[PDB]
Amino acid sequence: TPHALLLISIDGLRADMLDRGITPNLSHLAREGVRARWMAPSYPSLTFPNHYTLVTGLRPDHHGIVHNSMRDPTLGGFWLSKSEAVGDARWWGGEPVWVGVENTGQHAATWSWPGSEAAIKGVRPSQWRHYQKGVRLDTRVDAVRGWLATDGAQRNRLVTLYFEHVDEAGHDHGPESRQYADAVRAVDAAIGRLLAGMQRDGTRARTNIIVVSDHGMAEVAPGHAISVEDIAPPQIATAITDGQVIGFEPLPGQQAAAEASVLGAHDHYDCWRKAELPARWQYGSHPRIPSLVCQMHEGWDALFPDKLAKRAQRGTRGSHGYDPALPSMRAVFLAQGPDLAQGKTLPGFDNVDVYALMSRLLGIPAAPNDGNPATLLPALRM
Numbered sequence: 001t002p003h004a005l006l007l008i009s010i011d012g013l014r015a016d017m018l019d020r021g022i023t024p025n026l027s028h029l030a031r032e033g034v035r036a037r038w039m040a041p042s043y044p045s046l047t048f049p050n051h052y053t054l055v056t057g058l059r060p061d062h063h064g065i066v067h068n069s070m071r072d073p074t075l076g077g078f079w080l081s082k083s084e085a086v087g088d089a090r091w092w093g094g095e096p097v098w099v100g101v102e103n104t105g106q107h108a109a110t111w112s113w114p115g116s117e118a119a120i121k122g123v124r125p126s127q128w129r130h131y132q133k134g135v136r137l138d139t140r141v142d143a144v145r146g147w148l149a150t151d152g153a154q155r156n157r158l159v160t161l162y163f164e165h166v167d168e169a170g171h172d173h174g175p176e177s178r179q180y181a182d183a184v185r186a187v188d189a190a191i192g193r194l195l196a197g198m199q200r201d202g203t204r205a206r207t208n209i210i211v212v213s214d215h216g217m218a219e220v221a222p223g224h225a226i227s228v229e230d231i232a233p234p235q236i237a238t239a240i241t242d243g244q245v246i247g248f249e250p251l252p253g254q255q256a257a258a259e260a261s262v263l264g265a266h267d268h269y270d271c272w273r274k275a276e277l278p279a280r281w282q283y284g285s286h287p288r289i290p291s292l293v294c295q296m297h298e299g300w301d302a303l304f305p306d307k308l309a310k311r312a313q314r315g316t317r318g319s320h321g322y323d324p325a326l327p328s329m330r331a332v333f334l335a336q337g338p339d340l341a342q343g344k345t346l347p348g349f350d351n352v353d354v355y356a357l358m359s360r361l362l363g364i365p366a367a368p369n370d371g372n373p374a375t376l377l378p379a380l381r382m
Protein backbone atom coordinates (compact mmCIF):
# COMPACT_ATOMS: atom_id res chain seq x y z
CA THR A 1 0.00 0.00 0.00
CA PRO A 2 1.51 3.35 -1.07
CA HIS A 3 2.08 6.19 1.41
CA ALA A 4 -0.90 8.54 1.76
CA LEU A 5 -0.61 12.33 1.45
CA LEU A 6 -2.38 14.64 3.92
CA LEU A 7 -2.68 18.20 2.49
CA ILE A 8 -3.58 20.90 4.99
CA SER A 9 -4.36 24.53 4.10
CA ILE A 10 -4.40 27.24 6.76
CA ASP A 11 -6.16 30.09 4.95
CA GLY A 12 -4.36 33.42 5.31
CA LEU A 13 -1.34 32.27 7.36
CA ARG A 14 1.47 34.69 6.58
CA ALA A 15 4.93 33.20 6.14
CA ASP A 16 6.51 34.94 9.15
CA MET A 17 3.89 33.54 11.56
CA LEU A 18 5.89 30.31 12.09
CA ASP A 19 8.59 32.38 13.80
CA ARG A 20 6.62 34.02 16.62
CA GLY A 21 6.39 31.13 19.12
CA ILE A 22 2.69 30.58 18.39
CA THR A 23 2.91 27.40 16.24
CA PRO A 24 4.56 24.74 18.45
CA ASN A 25 3.14 21.80 16.49
CA LEU A 26 3.85 23.24 13.03
CA SER A 27 7.32 24.46 14.09
CA HIS A 28 8.14 20.95 15.33
CA LEU A 29 6.79 19.43 12.09
CA ALA A 30 9.01 21.80 10.10
CA ARG A 31 12.14 20.90 12.09
CA GLU A 32 11.44 17.21 11.50
CA GLY A 33 10.83 17.72 7.79
CA VAL A 34 11.13 20.47 5.21
CA ARG A 35 10.31 24.17 5.38
CA ALA A 36 10.50 26.84 2.67
CA ARG A 37 11.39 30.37 3.69
CA TRP A 38 8.05 31.34 2.16
CA MET A 39 5.82 30.50 -0.82
CA ALA A 40 4.54 33.20 -3.15
CA PRO A 41 0.89 33.14 -4.16
CA SER A 42 -0.24 33.57 -7.74
CA TYR A 43 -2.13 36.61 -9.03
CA PRO A 44 -4.67 37.47 -7.72
CA SER A 45 -3.73 36.70 -4.10
CA LEU A 46 -7.26 35.54 -3.23
CA THR A 47 -8.62 32.31 -1.75
CA PHE A 48 -10.33 30.45 -4.59
CA PRO A 49 -7.77 31.27 -7.27
CA ASN A 50 -4.84 30.23 -5.09
CA HIS A 51 -6.30 27.10 -3.51
CA TYR A 52 -7.16 25.95 -7.04
CA THR A 53 -3.64 26.79 -8.27
CA LEU A 54 -2.18 24.72 -5.44
CA VAL A 55 -3.95 21.52 -6.51
CA THR A 56 -3.62 22.02 -10.33
CA GLY A 57 -0.20 23.66 -10.76
CA LEU A 58 -1.85 26.25 -13.00
CA ARG A 59 -1.90 30.02 -12.71
CA PRO A 60 -5.40 31.47 -12.33
CA ASP A 61 -5.11 32.93 -15.87
CA HIS A 62 -4.99 29.32 -17.11
CA HIS A 63 -7.32 27.42 -14.78
CA GLY A 64 -10.17 29.98 -15.12
CA ILE A 65 -10.86 30.68 -11.44
CA VAL A 66 -9.60 34.20 -12.01
CA HIS A 67 -11.21 35.81 -8.96
CA ASN A 68 -13.45 34.77 -6.08
CA SER A 69 -16.28 36.54 -7.98
CA MET A 70 -16.65 36.20 -11.76
CA ARG A 71 -18.99 36.56 -14.74
CA ASP A 72 -19.02 34.26 -17.80
CA PRO A 73 -21.10 34.80 -20.98
CA THR A 74 -22.47 31.24 -20.91
CA LEU A 75 -22.22 30.17 -17.25
CA GLY A 76 -23.40 33.43 -15.67
CA GLY A 77 -22.25 34.57 -12.23
CA PHE A 78 -19.87 32.83 -9.80
CA TRP A 79 -19.06 33.72 -6.19
CA LEU A 80 -18.20 31.73 -3.06
CA SER A 81 -21.72 31.39 -1.61
CA LYS A 82 -23.32 30.59 -5.01
CA SER A 83 -23.44 26.79 -4.58
CA GLU A 84 -24.64 25.75 -8.07
CA ALA A 85 -21.88 27.82 -9.66
CA VAL A 86 -19.16 26.55 -7.32
CA GLY A 87 -20.48 23.00 -7.86
CA ASP A 88 -20.49 23.35 -11.70
CA ALA A 89 -17.40 21.68 -13.18
CA ARG A 90 -17.49 23.95 -16.27
CA TRP A 91 -15.88 26.80 -14.26
CA TRP A 92 -12.89 24.71 -13.25
CA GLY A 93 -10.03 24.13 -15.70
CA GLY A 94 -7.14 21.69 -15.57
CA GLU A 95 -6.91 18.58 -13.41
CA PRO A 96 -6.80 18.88 -9.62
CA VAL A 97 -4.81 16.21 -7.77
CA TRP A 98 -7.94 14.42 -6.47
CA VAL A 99 -9.12 13.79 -10.05
CA GLY A 100 -5.71 12.36 -10.89
CA VAL A 101 -5.88 10.14 -7.83
CA GLU A 102 -9.42 8.83 -8.55
CA ASN A 103 -8.47 8.13 -12.20
CA THR A 104 -5.74 5.68 -11.08
CA GLY A 105 -8.29 3.66 -9.07
CA GLN A 106 -7.20 5.18 -5.77
CA HIS A 107 -9.35 7.40 -3.57
CA ALA A 108 -9.35 11.00 -2.38
CA ALA A 109 -11.12 12.54 0.59
CA THR A 110 -11.48 16.33 0.80
CA TRP A 111 -12.61 18.53 3.67
CA SER A 112 -13.74 21.64 1.80
CA TRP A 113 -11.05 22.40 -0.74
CA PRO A 114 -12.13 24.93 -3.36
CA GLY A 115 -13.32 22.89 -6.39
CA SER A 116 -14.08 19.71 -4.41
CA GLU A 117 -17.88 20.21 -4.66
CA ALA A 118 -17.78 19.88 -8.47
CA ALA A 119 -17.19 16.89 -10.77
CA ILE A 120 -14.10 18.30 -12.46
CA LYS A 121 -13.27 16.40 -15.64
CA GLY A 122 -16.28 14.32 -14.53
CA VAL A 123 -14.59 13.08 -11.37
CA ARG A 124 -15.61 13.84 -7.78
CA PRO A 125 -13.53 12.87 -4.76
CA SER A 126 -14.71 9.76 -2.96
CA GLN A 127 -15.40 11.83 0.17
CA TRP A 128 -16.32 15.54 0.10
CA ARG A 129 -18.85 18.01 1.47
CA HIS A 130 -20.58 21.32 1.01
CA TYR A 131 -18.65 24.05 2.81
CA GLN A 132 -20.49 25.34 5.86
CA LYS A 133 -19.48 28.19 8.15
CA GLY A 134 -18.56 27.55 11.76
CA VAL A 135 -17.79 23.83 11.77
CA ARG A 136 -15.84 22.94 14.89
CA LEU A 137 -12.08 22.36 14.78
CA ASP A 138 -12.44 18.88 16.36
CA THR A 139 -15.23 17.93 13.95
CA ARG A 140 -13.04 18.36 10.89
CA VAL A 141 -9.90 16.90 12.48
CA ASP A 142 -11.75 13.81 13.60
CA ALA A 143 -13.27 13.32 10.11
CA VAL A 144 -9.84 13.63 8.48
CA ARG A 145 -8.33 11.28 11.02
CA GLY A 146 -11.10 8.84 10.12
CA TRP A 147 -10.41 9.17 6.42
CA LEU A 148 -6.70 8.41 6.92
CA ALA A 149 -7.54 5.27 8.93
CA THR A 150 -9.97 3.74 6.40
CA ASP A 151 -8.74 0.49 4.87
CA GLY A 152 -10.02 -2.05 2.36
CA ALA A 153 -11.15 -0.69 -0.99
CA GLN A 154 -12.12 2.69 0.57
CA ARG A 155 -8.48 3.51 1.44
CA ASN A 156 -7.61 7.18 0.76
CA ARG A 157 -4.31 7.97 -0.99
CA LEU A 158 -5.09 11.69 -0.60
CA VAL A 159 -6.80 13.45 2.28
CA THR A 160 -7.21 17.26 2.43
CA LEU A 161 -8.03 19.54 5.36
CA TYR A 162 -8.85 23.27 5.33
CA PHE A 163 -9.08 25.90 8.07
CA GLU A 164 -10.62 29.38 7.56
CA HIS A 165 -10.06 30.75 11.07
CA VAL A 166 -6.77 32.61 10.62
CA ASP A 167 -8.05 34.34 7.49
CA GLU A 168 -11.30 35.41 9.15
CA ALA A 169 -9.48 36.75 12.22
CA GLY A 170 -7.06 38.56 9.89
CA HIS A 171 -9.85 40.35 8.07
CA ASP A 172 -11.66 41.31 11.25
CA HIS A 173 -8.66 42.58 13.28
CA GLY A 174 -5.44 42.57 11.28
CA PRO A 175 -2.41 40.28 11.17
CA GLU A 176 -0.69 41.86 14.21
CA SER A 177 -3.81 41.50 16.38
CA ARG A 178 -4.17 39.22 19.37
CA GLN A 179 -7.20 37.71 17.57
CA TYR A 180 -5.11 36.63 14.57
CA ALA A 181 -2.52 35.10 16.90
CA ASP A 182 -5.23 33.30 18.89
CA ALA A 183 -6.53 31.79 15.64
CA VAL A 184 -3.02 30.69 14.59
CA ARG A 185 -2.54 29.05 18.01
CA ALA A 186 -5.93 27.31 17.83
CA VAL A 187 -5.45 25.88 14.35
CA ASP A 188 -1.91 24.81 15.34
CA ALA A 189 -3.29 23.02 18.41
CA ALA A 190 -5.93 21.31 16.32
CA ILE A 191 -3.22 20.09 13.95
CA GLY A 192 -1.31 18.78 16.98
CA ARG A 193 -4.39 16.82 18.04
CA LEU A 194 -4.67 15.36 14.53
CA LEU A 195 -1.00 14.31 14.50
CA ALA A 196 -1.26 12.66 17.94
CA GLY A 197 -4.38 10.79 16.80
CA MET A 198 -2.67 9.62 13.62
CA GLN A 199 0.15 8.29 15.79
CA ARG A 200 -2.31 6.38 18.02
CA ASP A 201 -4.00 5.01 14.85
CA GLY A 202 -0.62 4.06 13.35
CA THR A 203 -1.30 6.21 10.26
CA ARG A 204 1.34 8.86 11.05
CA ALA A 205 4.35 6.82 9.97
CA ARG A 206 2.95 5.99 6.52
CA THR A 207 1.51 9.45 5.73
CA ASN A 208 3.35 12.32 4.07
CA ILE A 209 2.09 15.73 5.18
CA ILE A 210 2.16 19.09 3.38
CA VAL A 211 1.00 22.26 5.14
CA VAL A 212 0.42 25.34 2.99
CA SER A 213 -1.48 28.58 3.02
CA ASP A 214 -3.04 30.36 0.04
CA HIS A 215 -1.62 33.83 0.83
CA GLY A 216 -0.62 36.03 3.76
CA MET A 217 -2.36 39.07 5.24
CA ALA A 218 -1.72 42.82 5.40
CA GLU A 219 -2.96 45.40 7.88
CA VAL A 220 -5.73 47.75 6.79
CA ALA A 221 -5.57 50.58 9.29
CA PRO A 222 -8.61 52.87 9.82
CA GLY A 223 -9.38 55.26 6.93
CA HIS A 224 -7.94 52.94 4.25
CA ALA A 225 -11.25 52.24 2.44
CA ILE A 226 -12.61 54.05 -0.65
CA SER A 227 -15.69 53.41 -2.82
CA VAL A 228 -15.26 51.55 -6.11
CA GLU A 229 -17.35 54.40 -7.53
CA ASP A 230 -14.48 56.79 -6.69
CA ILE A 231 -12.46 54.89 -9.30
CA ALA A 232 -15.15 54.97 -11.97
CA PRO A 233 -18.69 56.32 -11.74
CA PRO A 234 -21.49 53.74 -12.34
CA GLN A 235 -22.72 55.58 -15.44
CA ILE A 236 -19.46 54.82 -17.29
CA ALA A 237 -18.45 51.41 -15.85
CA THR A 238 -19.69 48.55 -13.71
CA ALA A 239 -17.47 47.29 -10.89
CA ILE A 240 -17.58 43.53 -11.28
CA THR A 241 -15.55 42.99 -8.11
CA ASP A 242 -14.58 45.03 -5.08
CA GLY A 243 -11.93 44.64 -2.37
CA GLN A 244 -8.38 44.84 -3.75
CA VAL A 245 -8.53 43.49 -7.32
CA ILE A 246 -11.19 45.66 -8.88
CA GLY A 247 -12.50 44.64 -12.30
CA PHE A 248 -14.48 47.15 -14.38
CA GLU A 249 -16.57 46.63 -17.49
CA PRO A 250 -17.38 49.86 -19.31
CA LEU A 251 -21.02 50.45 -20.27
CA PRO A 252 -21.77 50.30 -24.01
CA GLY A 253 -20.00 53.12 -25.86
CA GLN A 254 -18.24 54.16 -22.62
CA GLN A 255 -14.86 52.40 -23.12
CA ALA A 256 -13.17 55.74 -23.89
CA ALA A 257 -14.63 57.60 -20.89
CA ALA A 258 -13.92 54.61 -18.62
CA GLU A 259 -10.34 54.43 -19.86
CA ALA A 260 -9.86 58.18 -19.46
CA SER A 261 -10.90 58.06 -15.79
CA VAL A 262 -9.50 54.64 -14.80
CA LEU A 263 -6.26 53.94 -16.65
CA GLY A 264 -2.89 54.63 -15.09
CA ALA A 265 -1.62 55.73 -11.71
CA HIS A 266 -3.80 57.08 -8.90
CA ASP A 267 -3.31 57.92 -5.21
CA HIS A 268 -3.76 54.39 -3.76
CA TYR A 269 -4.23 52.19 -6.81
CA ASP A 270 -3.24 51.62 -10.42
CA CYS A 271 -5.38 50.38 -13.32
CA TRP A 272 -4.66 48.68 -16.63
CA ARG A 273 -6.38 47.23 -19.63
CA LYS A 274 -6.28 43.50 -18.87
CA ALA A 275 -3.91 42.78 -21.82
CA GLU A 276 -1.53 45.40 -20.40
CA LEU A 277 -1.35 44.15 -16.81
CA PRO A 278 2.21 43.78 -15.47
CA ALA A 279 3.73 40.72 -17.12
CA ARG A 280 5.08 39.46 -13.78
CA TRP A 281 1.51 38.73 -12.66
CA GLN A 282 0.91 36.35 -15.60
CA TYR A 283 -2.70 37.45 -15.71
CA GLY A 284 -5.10 39.11 -18.11
CA SER A 285 -5.49 36.73 -21.08
CA HIS A 286 -8.45 34.77 -19.70
CA PRO A 287 -11.80 35.82 -21.20
CA ARG A 288 -13.48 35.94 -17.76
CA ILE A 289 -11.23 38.81 -16.62
CA PRO A 290 -13.03 42.17 -16.95
CA SER A 291 -11.78 44.64 -19.58
CA LEU A 292 -10.15 46.90 -16.97
CA VAL A 293 -8.41 45.75 -13.81
CA CYS A 294 -7.28 47.94 -10.92
CA GLN A 295 -4.94 46.81 -8.16
CA MET A 296 -5.28 48.58 -4.83
CA HIS A 297 -2.04 49.42 -3.06
CA GLU A 298 -1.05 47.37 -0.01
CA GLY A 299 -3.29 48.24 2.96
CA TRP A 300 -6.15 49.79 0.98
CA ASP A 301 -9.66 48.51 0.16
CA ALA A 302 -12.16 49.74 -2.45
CA LEU A 303 -15.72 48.72 -1.58
CA PHE A 304 -19.14 48.63 -3.15
CA PRO A 305 -20.93 51.77 -1.92
CA ASP A 306 -23.44 49.93 0.32
CA LYS A 307 -20.57 48.03 2.06
CA LEU A 308 -18.53 51.16 2.56
CA ALA A 309 -21.53 52.62 4.39
CA LYS A 310 -21.94 49.70 6.84
CA ARG A 311 -18.16 49.48 7.37
CA ALA A 312 -18.22 50.43 11.08
CA GLN A 313 -15.55 53.14 10.86
CA ARG A 314 -13.51 52.19 13.92
CA GLY A 315 -10.80 49.56 14.14
CA THR A 316 -7.87 47.94 12.40
CA ARG A 317 -8.65 45.24 9.84
CA GLY A 318 -6.76 43.08 7.36
CA SER A 319 -6.83 42.19 3.69
CA HIS A 320 -4.94 40.23 1.11
CA GLY A 321 -5.43 40.38 -2.66
CA TYR A 322 -2.36 42.59 -3.02
CA ASP A 323 0.69 42.19 -5.30
CA PRO A 324 1.82 38.55 -4.71
CA ALA A 325 5.49 39.59 -4.45
CA LEU A 326 4.86 41.63 -1.29
CA PRO A 327 6.30 40.09 1.87
CA SER A 328 2.89 40.56 3.54
CA MET A 329 1.31 38.26 0.92
CA ARG A 330 3.83 35.44 1.46
CA ALA A 331 2.37 32.06 2.26
CA VAL A 332 3.63 28.99 4.13
CA PHE A 333 5.05 25.73 2.79
CA LEU A 334 6.26 22.90 4.96
CA ALA A 335 6.23 19.14 4.58
CA GLN A 336 7.17 16.08 6.57
CA GLY A 337 6.87 12.33 6.14
CA PRO A 338 8.48 9.02 5.08
CA ASP A 339 9.14 10.26 1.53
CA LEU A 340 10.29 13.78 2.49
CA ALA A 341 13.65 15.21 3.60
CA GLN A 342 14.49 15.79 7.25
CA GLY A 343 15.67 19.04 8.83
CA LYS A 344 15.88 20.95 5.54
CA THR A 345 15.18 24.52 4.53
CA LEU A 346 14.26 25.57 0.97
CA PRO A 347 14.47 28.93 -0.74
CA GLY A 348 11.29 30.91 -1.30
CA PHE A 349 9.39 29.67 -4.36
CA ASP A 350 6.15 30.09 -6.44
CA ASN A 351 3.02 28.11 -5.46
CA VAL A 352 2.59 26.61 -8.94
CA ASP A 353 5.53 24.34 -8.04
CA VAL A 354 3.69 22.38 -5.31
CA TYR A 355 1.64 20.32 -7.79
CA ALA A 356 4.66 18.51 -9.29
CA LEU A 357 5.70 17.39 -5.81
CA MET A 358 2.20 16.22 -4.90
CA SER A 359 1.78 14.27 -8.15
CA ARG A 360 4.98 12.37 -7.32
CA LEU A 361 3.89 11.67 -3.71
CA LEU A 362 0.45 10.50 -4.98
CA GLY A 363 1.76 8.17 -7.69
CA ILE A 364 -0.19 9.94 -10.41
CA PRO A 365 1.05 11.14 -13.78
CA ALA A 366 1.62 14.90 -13.60
CA ALA A 367 -0.89 16.78 -15.73
CA PRO A 368 0.57 19.57 -17.83
CA ASN A 369 1.18 22.53 -15.57
CA ASP A 370 2.83 25.93 -15.10
CA GLY A 371 5.26 24.83 -12.40
CA ASN A 372 8.83 23.59 -12.39
CA PRO A 373 9.35 20.02 -11.08
CA ALA A 374 12.96 20.86 -10.22
CA THR A 375 11.97 23.29 -7.47
CA LEU A 376 10.70 20.79 -4.91
CA LEU A 377 12.83 17.76 -5.78
CA PRO A 378 15.09 18.72 -2.83
CA ALA A 379 12.02 18.26 -0.55
CA LEU A 380 12.18 14.51 -1.30
CA ARG A 381 14.08 12.23 1.05
CA MET A 382 16.06 10.95 -1.92
Ligand SMILES: Nc1ncnc2c1ncn2[C@@H]1O[C@H](COP(=O)(O)O)[C@@H](O)[C@H]1O
Pocket residue numbers: 011012046047048068080081112113114115131133164167168
Ligand atom coordinates in the same frame (compact mmCIF):
# COMPACT_ATOMS: atom_id res chain seq x y z
N1 LIG B 1 -14.75 25.59 -0.32
C1 LIG B 1 -15.32 26.76 0.05
N2 LIG B 1 -16.56 27.13 -0.33
C2 LIG B 1 -17.13 28.30 0.04
N3 LIG B 1 -16.50 29.20 0.83
C3 LIG B 1 -15.24 28.97 1.28
C4 LIG B 1 -14.58 27.71 0.91
N4 LIG B 1 -13.37 27.71 1.48
C5 LIG B 1 -13.26 28.88 2.16
N5 LIG B 1 -14.37 29.63 2.05
C6 LIG B 1 -14.59 30.96 2.69
O1 LIG B 1 -13.96 32.02 1.96
C7 LIG B 1 -13.33 32.96 2.84
C8 LIG B 1 -11.89 33.16 2.37
O2 LIG B 1 -11.82 34.16 1.35
P1 LIG B 1 -10.53 35.13 1.23
O3 LIG B 1 -10.93 36.36 2.00
O4 LIG B 1 -10.33 35.28 -0.29
O5 LIG B 1 -9.38 34.37 1.87
C9 LIG B 1 -13.38 32.37 4.25
O6 LIG B 1 -14.16 33.17 5.15
C10 LIG B 1 -14.01 31.00 4.11
O7 LIG B 1 -15.01 30.79 5.11
Ligand SMILES: [Zn+2]
Pocket residue numbers: 011012046047048167214215
Ligand atom coordinates in the same frame (compact mmCIF):
# COMPACT_ATOMS: atom_id res chain seq x y z
ZN1 LIG C 1 -7.50 32.76 1.55
Ligand SMILES: [Zn+2]
Pocket residue numbers: 012047167168171320
Ligand atom coordinates in the same frame (compact mmCIF):
# COMPACT_ATOMS: atom_id res chain seq x y z
ZN1 LIG D 1 -9.40 36.31 3.13
